[PDB]
């Protein structure tokens, strides 16, 4: 039989827990045991890939959504998968909200069995993103769990599942083996017979195994990866596609008129952006785990499927390392070294220095700021690194006293989480607001576009909305995007082929729990033997 050796997580020892609703479970439970209704391929525009459902449709008013269940799907014990399972599972999370790890109860007010193979979700808000959120919620077997005395402690050690790997073939403290569902609805597509899951205590133990070609699918940091791993074996590969954006935010409402003269000037923001060497920041501060973000809108290569490439290309030159271009733009904009001290003054002739902050102890951010300070000095922009404690860094943004700040941003499946949290002016005021929108650039058309993004279920309309957002942010160079993080991923072609890669970039490739596309990925693999 073909065994695929995977490492979704580290453990000090294997504890047999396949309850998909508990934080303490094994990280091969979701997707591989409990298959979703739909897997959203987030890298491909968040396009739905229909699995246990064959379709869904939102109501015209976006207040409900129906899913058509695929007929002929079996649980691993042979019983039919039906709407009863979906209704049961959402009812369990409503009754036991400690099992609702994602807070789906906020969005779904009720779930209706329309017929044996159709379920209707009634929603608390007109919101076309709720199908995506629904897709993340594990669906368990009503005919089993109805008999479970306490689902919040149930370890589910003999799981009955819909997904590809439900058979607990081997379970020991050091290793478990999870073998193919003998009733799998998509069995013809599944060529891997079992997941082999070794107990690995830490990243150093993983390193020794991966360089010896003992693993197939991993998602860990590998030091010196090209020399020690990738170049060492023609079967050793990796692919680190772009994840979440990180950027310098500038304070458009800086109280200091000299600093405001610089920061509230689009040519200055573009020159600041051209001074940065993003790839060197990624290589030094982030150990190589990232991708340059050269989108003026911050969209990033994670969401290239959403990009208007005309807009990206028009402003990409302002977000590329270009020392001579940076100096030329500063001069054209009137930022000239008038006193000869090596640094540019504002067009009105005022000296200024930008205080660039990141949180104390966040070493990767701290090193990014220091690198940026040196890069900015090369074009004549006077900057100093500051490392206040997080509460002070955050307060300076909430109160609008900071100059420039380096920050990351929330992760989302589409560009809305980044663009809304990072730019909606409604998030610049109020009790409890986080830092992410506190550049104090305001555009009410931008706000309206964001507020409309999930008020349509038409993807062509959403793409048009995204393109309008992208244009507004890019043409104003609102922030200075630096980099995108990495979906960490290494793969071995010794025993299997079909892997996703830069040459075959079919989706997010990581093996982590929480990556629904790992189900699609394992269905593309083929044993060499
Ligand atoms: Mg000067």
Author numbering: 1 to 529
From the paper:
Periplasmic solute-binding proteins (SBPs) specific for chitooligosaccharides, (GlcNAc)n (n = 2, 3, 4, 5 and 6), are involved in the uptake of chitinous nutrients and the negative control of chitin signal transduction in Vibrios. Here we propose three-domain mechanism of the (GlcNAc)n translocation based on experiments using a recombinant VcCBP, SBP specific for (GlcNAc)n from Vibrio cholerae. X-ray crystal structures of unliganded or (GlcNAc)3-liganded VcCBP solved at 1.2–1.6 Å revealed three distinct domains, the Upper1, Upper2 and Lower domains for this protein. Based on the crystal structures and molecular dynamics simulation, we here propose that the three domains, Upper1, Upper2, and Lower domains, which correspond to domains I, II, and III, respectively, are required to explain the translocation process of (GlcNAc)2 by CBP.
We solved the structure of unliganded protein (open form) at 1.6 Å, a higher resolution than the VcCBP structures formerly deposited (2.2–2.3 Å resolution). The unliganded form exhibited the largest motion (RMSD, 0.8 nm) of the entire protein molecule, while the motions of the individual domains remained at lower levels (RMSD, 0.1–0.3 nm). This clearly indicated a domain motion, in which the individual domains did not change their own conformations but changed their relative arrangement. In unliganded VcCBP, essential subspaces were widely extended as compared with the liganded VcBP (eigenvector1/eigenvector, -7 ~ 15 nm/-22 ~ 9 nm) revealing a large conformational change from the open state to the closed state. In unliganded VcCBP, strong self-positive correlations (red) were found in the region of residue No. 1-239, which corresponds to Upper1 + Upper2 domains, and also in residue No. 350-440, which includes amino acid residues interacting with the ligand from Lower domain. However, strong inter-negative correlations (blue) were found between 1 and 239 (Upper1 + Upper2) and 350–440 (the interacting region of Lower domain). Furthermore, inter-correlations between 140 and 239 (inner Upper1) and 1–35 (N-terminal Upper1) were rather positive (red). It was clear that Upper1 and Upper2 domains move unitedly in the unliganded state, but that these two domains move independently in the (GlcNAc)3-liganded state.
